[PDB]
Design a protein around this nucleic acid. Structure first.
Lengths: 105, 246, 72, 60, 50
RNA sequence: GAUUCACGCAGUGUUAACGUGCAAAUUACUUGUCAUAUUUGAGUAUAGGGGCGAAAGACUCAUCGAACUAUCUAGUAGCUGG
RNA sequence: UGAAACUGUCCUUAGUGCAGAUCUUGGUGGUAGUAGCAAAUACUAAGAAGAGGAAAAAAACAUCUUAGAACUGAAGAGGAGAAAGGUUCCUAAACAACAUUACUUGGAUUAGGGUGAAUCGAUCCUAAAUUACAGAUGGAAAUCCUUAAGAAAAGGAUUGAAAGGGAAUAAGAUUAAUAGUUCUUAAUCAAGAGAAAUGGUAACAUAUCAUGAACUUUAAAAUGGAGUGUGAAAAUCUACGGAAGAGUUCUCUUUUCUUCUUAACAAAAGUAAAUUCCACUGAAAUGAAUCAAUCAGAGAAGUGGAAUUUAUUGGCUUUGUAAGAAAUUCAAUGAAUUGUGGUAUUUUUGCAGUCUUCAUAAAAAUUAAAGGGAAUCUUUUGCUCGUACUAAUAACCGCAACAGGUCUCCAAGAAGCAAAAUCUUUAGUUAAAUAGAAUAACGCAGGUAAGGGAAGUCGGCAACAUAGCUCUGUAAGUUAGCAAGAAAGAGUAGCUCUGGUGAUCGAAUCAGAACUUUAAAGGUUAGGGGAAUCCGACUGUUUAAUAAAAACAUAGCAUUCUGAUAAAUCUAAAAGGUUCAUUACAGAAUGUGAUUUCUGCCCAGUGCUCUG
RNA sequence: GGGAACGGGCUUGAUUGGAACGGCGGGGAAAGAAGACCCUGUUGAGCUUGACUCUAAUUUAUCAUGUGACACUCAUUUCGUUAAAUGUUAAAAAACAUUAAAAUGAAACAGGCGAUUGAAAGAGAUAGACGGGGAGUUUGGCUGG
RNA sequence: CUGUUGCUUAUAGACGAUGGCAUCAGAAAUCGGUGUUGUAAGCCUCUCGGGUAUUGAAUG
RNA sequence: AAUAAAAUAUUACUUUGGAUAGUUUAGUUUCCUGGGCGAUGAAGAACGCAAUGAAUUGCGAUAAGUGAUAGGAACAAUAAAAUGUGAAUAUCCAAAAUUUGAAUGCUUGAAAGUAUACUAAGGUAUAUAUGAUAUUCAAUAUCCA
């Protein structure tokens, strides 16, 4: 087999020193540098991973399109649909209860 | 002779607290008008494990009384607290588990925890796992109340000293027998450097006052006065009694 | 193993060059110079070191300005 | 390939060459040598031939 | 090391420059006693300690 | 914080080699151990009647029952040598 | 002999007379042409260069090329880095000294040459920690404090990582030596310049689109380990079909071997695995499923959808780059080729759930989104510093080319359970403190041995011996978990067959049957076993360099003090410090040392204590 | 033999050919080290202890002038905050809450930022106790060792 | 006369020494005798085969 | 008994070594005269500069030296060029005076850097403490409408 060497001067297998050995022209293999695996967005209430948003590095969200870093809904990109649905029902039902309980019962 | 290990502990070089992953300081919120004369509501967002302490810690979020924003707190969780719970702090708070009330509002016989020794000092007594203080009696003549500390001693505090109603969570932690020296080694991961304790009799005369001779023995009485200088105060200090009590 | 063997791991410098006196006497972890007594404003001199005084003192260098003022 | 002052940077070396020799520069790479001098690799525009520029200097 | 500070590299270059012998023309001066430089060193003989 | 083998590490025995040595502590075989009380780098913290020590008066730059260095100091010597 | 100063007498003066002090400094003998130049398997033939293999064999001859023969054996004697070194790197001339012979060789002498970055790092951020002004403290030097003490800093100052976090570059070619740095081609990033939208029931989706200030919130950067299953890639192995070259060939072999490749960044023909959500319906005769689990009326299964992860866009094939490169051939610059598969093994990289903790396993720079509703394609630039070489049986630390020590990355075949021992391929090397003849004693290292079998010896020290796998079998004792691989016994080769274990052709694995032989684990690797007693309960640690243990630790047990302005305790002092980001299930000080059983009598003496 | 009582040298004898190679371990009371065992120094050091003499830490008493006759706070102590409403008058719901309308809204004043301790306690001076935690030093002579 | 030297000399041997021969010398293969192993390679038979055999063996 | 190879002894010559003699631009001591540094940036450190330099000496981007004043014909190891229209040489003078260092805008490890204002670059200034003056303020601290 073909053995390879690090290209940069980092000699230790740290988290930021990940490599991939891929085949090149002529049969020789070159060394790449692979990105770290990143987490996604979580709902602020239930801590569940949000859908519709990619799991990329924080600085790479700026390069994405405007619609690719959020969801077209209230609290989109910070609250899940279950998280939001309870917020709406909490807001309406509590105010309605206050209207009859107090406020000229 | 040399300096004993008890003396080297006071300089605090390798004996400093291993408090790097600790959540923070666990205490009540700073006392303001809205808690002296009214009540505030806090949401228990999460319950976490504070390294180095046996009881869980609660991340309570009070909204704000005077400005716009949030007030993120860090309480010592009472047993029975759950995520999403509403707790209330204030003079007019109801007598429920987890609420923080002035000690004078608690009826006699109430079980409280995280009691303040001085009003507004954010909790001193009854903070370890499963520990609590009991309200003994009130005294409205001088605005003072009596409570029973977890050690059995009685203490007289101002009636507006604050405490949380309930038991500190995590009780029964010390009833489980450590079996391995490794488990005891991990217990002090977020604590001080104390664990592997070499007996004084096993040392040399230079190292310890117990450092013996040809046979491992102390040689002199192990009960000492409180006025003994550091470096000779090894053993039992001001021991009223001694031996297997009956 | 306290002799030949233990010397193999000596590849970390205790002292580097000093900015004020030019000697390899700057302790990195102490952040001060063992020879000239750096950041301390006064140059480090001791009466028991009589030879160290005649190794770096007035007249042991170029005397760029004082060689003209005294002769004037 | 020139030998310059270490205190001059890539932008000062670039301007000095156009001023002194009347050429167009598209790239300057510099390295500091052990003896202290700064070696500059000044590349000229394709519309300018360095063969005549070097001859005028006296290299050839 | 490959990685070094700029001023440290210039002090390395000076030690290279000073590791040279007396030029021939200097040795032919009248009343000359300087034939070999005694402040000379080699990498494998004496470590310059910087 | 089970049993073993390997990469590594140690140092049980030979009281083997060597003992003006490869080496101011190493070599060979045998043996043991070989991931959670594990191994290890770098950064950092602790300094001499002090530090650090799972404790051997161990370790603190081949120096430790009190380091190294310089000054007092040409310390004193009823003792040895000239 | 030597070539420029000196002597005799009287007084004066003394750093004034040497055989010794293990005297000091320098020089020099015998020992003595003696001990040695013996680890790292190994060299040989022809030719060249050179003063340097001559000769009655003076039996040996340094460098380079070729041929033979070999070693390290891919956890390497291979290819690269961090620290350390500092020019040792490359070339030419030259060999006085140096590398225990010699050297035409060299990490040695002399002289030249060599290190190219918007994209790699430093620079930037913070971690453990570190240091300022003012203040506090001190006789002093100076110490303390790091946001508390302040008319200082919207909230708190400096430094601290070339392994942590982090905007963005790849392939090919090129040099005597540098190259994610130069050249060619192709990219990317940052900073600049030229009354406010739709679609889907929904999850959510639309080459910028489709405004979004103060303020606030959320998420990311950013989080242990074990073990199981599995997706993809690469390497190895292999099936089908070949093209080109090479090896063997009087004995066969439609044969053995080699090449058949392709980046960053983007595209979207075709098509996956896993997980989480959404719509319809409402499950009991309970179903669904995994290697294991696990799940369901706070809603299963089914049907149809949405999203995200899978080493860049979007995982894989494919496409642009792009064959014009490169590889392998052929001719004398020009021509040829560059399919398709695998229910195989290993490594790498993700994923999914399971387990484990009196352990819960970083922060900041910086980025995005939300709530709110204040206001109304082309082109330019990209600064500073490091960048050579070794990274070790010769470039580092040990006085040295020292068998010692010193952090990592990549990783072929056979055989095997195995990254074991052994052999080989790519790469490196045949030199690494000199050899030739002879073949005494005595050695060091490795072996064997008649008959006996520990009689030797303080003592089975040393050596021998056992040893892999399958089947049968396995005692006392016991904390019921073990003892246990107890002990003990049988089998094992080669060749020719049969059967079992799957999917809509393939895996090595298991069982059985004939026949033959030198009767089969044994080349390498590879437990000796049993019966008692003493100590320590166990895993662990220890006197670096004569003690590895019964010593230390340990869990268990027990005792003492302490309500925090405290206990212990550092400091000369201190709005000083540590346990303490703590609060009796805690902090501090001790003794004994797992479990079982039991801890008897004594308060006179010395301690300690008293609510006197 | 005698001698310092175990000679290579001296006395008397035995005896002797000069130069040495390979071994060898009897001797050279062989080399290595101003004996480490023992004793003597009016020589030390580590450790111990009601050895002698002291000392840090701890402790107790007195002094160091806050007011009114126990009460107060005013120095002092220990704290807490963004010095964020002090004092006197007048448990159904893990959601949002801010940049105000309107014609002040959103009340005034105190000589105390809010508590705690308190003329007591801390630090100083002097005096008694304690104090191997620690410092300095000593630990006779004769003597069939 | 003796010594060196040669037979990579033996009845000898650490090196010296000792012993033998030195042109009718010596050395060498080959062959025969003598041993060891066990029946070669090409096609059970060829096959008591093949191979080795002084190196410190014995003839020519 | 015998040989003198080795051994020993003396002299001459030579060698290894560097004593002795002769010599001194170096020291030691005493005395005399001063005791003349620095924010106008010192002492010290680093780096750089000669036609051929490595050290040392001298000097600082005007570099083994510039101007002025004295001075009057050299320097040399080699070659150049200049020179009585002034070479060497000397100086309390003039100009100039790199990076640091009390080091002082901020940072500084071996660190590369970086902010603001004035006058793209370049050059200045900006530490702490402190005296005087001016100016802008703060505190009902005292009066005070």
């Amino acid at each position: 087999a073909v053995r390879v060497t690090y290209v940069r001067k980092h000699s230790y297998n740290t988290k930021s020193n990940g490599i991939r050995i891929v085949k090149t022209a002529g049969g020789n293999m070159t060394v790449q540098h692979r990105q770290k695996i990143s987490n996604g967005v979580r709902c602020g209430d239930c801590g569940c991973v949000l859908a519709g948003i990619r799991h990329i590095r924080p600085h790479q969200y700026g390069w994405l399109g405007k619609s690719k870093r959020t969801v077209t809904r209230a609290y989109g990109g910070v609250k899940c649909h279950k998280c939001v649905q309870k917020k709406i029902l909490r807001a309406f039902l509590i105010n309605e209860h206050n209207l009859i309980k107090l406020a000229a019962a | 002779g040399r300096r004993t290990l008890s003396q080297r502990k006071g300089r605090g070089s390798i004996f400093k607290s291993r408090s790097h992953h600790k959540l923070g300081v666990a205490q009540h919120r700073a006392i303001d008008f809205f808690e002296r004369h009214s009540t505030v509501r806090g949401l228990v967002k999460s319950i976490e494990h504070d390294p180095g302490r046996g009881a869980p810690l609660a991340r309570v979020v009070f909204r704000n009384p005077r400005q716009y924003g949030l007030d993120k707190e860090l309480f010592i969780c009472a047993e029975g607290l759950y995520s999403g719970q509403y707790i209330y702090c204030g003079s007019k708070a109801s007598l429920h588990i987890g609420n923080v009330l002035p000690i004078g509002q608690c009826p006699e016989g109430t079980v409280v925890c995280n009691v303040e020794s001085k009003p507004g000092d954010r909790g001193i007594i009854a903070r370890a796992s499963g520990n609590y203080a009991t309200v003994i009696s009130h005294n409205a003549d001088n605005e003072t109340t009596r409570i029973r500390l977890p050690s059995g001693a009685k203490k007289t505090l101002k009636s507006n000293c604050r405490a949380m109603v309930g038991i500190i969570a995590g009780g029964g932690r010390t009833e489980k027998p450590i079996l391995k020296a490794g488990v005891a080694y991990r217990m002090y991961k977020a604590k001080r450097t104390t664990w592997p304790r070499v007996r004084g009799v096993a040392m040399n005369p230079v190292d310890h006052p117990h450092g013996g001779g040809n046979h491992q023995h102390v040689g002199h009485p192990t009960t000492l006065k409180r006025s003994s200088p550091p470096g000779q105060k090894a053993g039992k200090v001001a021991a009223r009694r001694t031996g297997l009590i009956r | 193993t306290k002799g030949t063997s233990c010397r193999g791991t000596r590849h970390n410098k205790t002292h580097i060059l000093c900015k004020r006196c030019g000697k390899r006497s700057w302790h990195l972890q102490k952040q001060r110079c063992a020879s000239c007594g750096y950041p301390d404003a006064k140059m480090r001199q001791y009466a028991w070191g009589y030879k160290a005084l005649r190794r770096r003192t007035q007249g042991t260098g170029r005397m760029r300005h004082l060689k003209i003022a005294l002769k004037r | 390939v020139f030998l310059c002052e270490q205190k001059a940077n890539k932008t000062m070396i670039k301007k000095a060459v156009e001023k002194r020799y009347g050429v167009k520069v598209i790239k300057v790479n510099t390295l500091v040598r052990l003896d202290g001098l700064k070696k500059a690799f000044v590349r000229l525009a394709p519309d300018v031939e360095a063969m005549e520029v070097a001859t005028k200097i006296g290299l050839f | 090391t490959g990685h070094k500070g700029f001023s440290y590299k210039l002090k390395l270059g000076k030690k290279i420059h000073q590791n040279r012998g007396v030029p021939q023309w200097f040795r032919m001066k009248t009343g000359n006693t300087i034939n070999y430089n005694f402040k000379r060193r080699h990498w494998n003989r004496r470590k310059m300690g910087m």
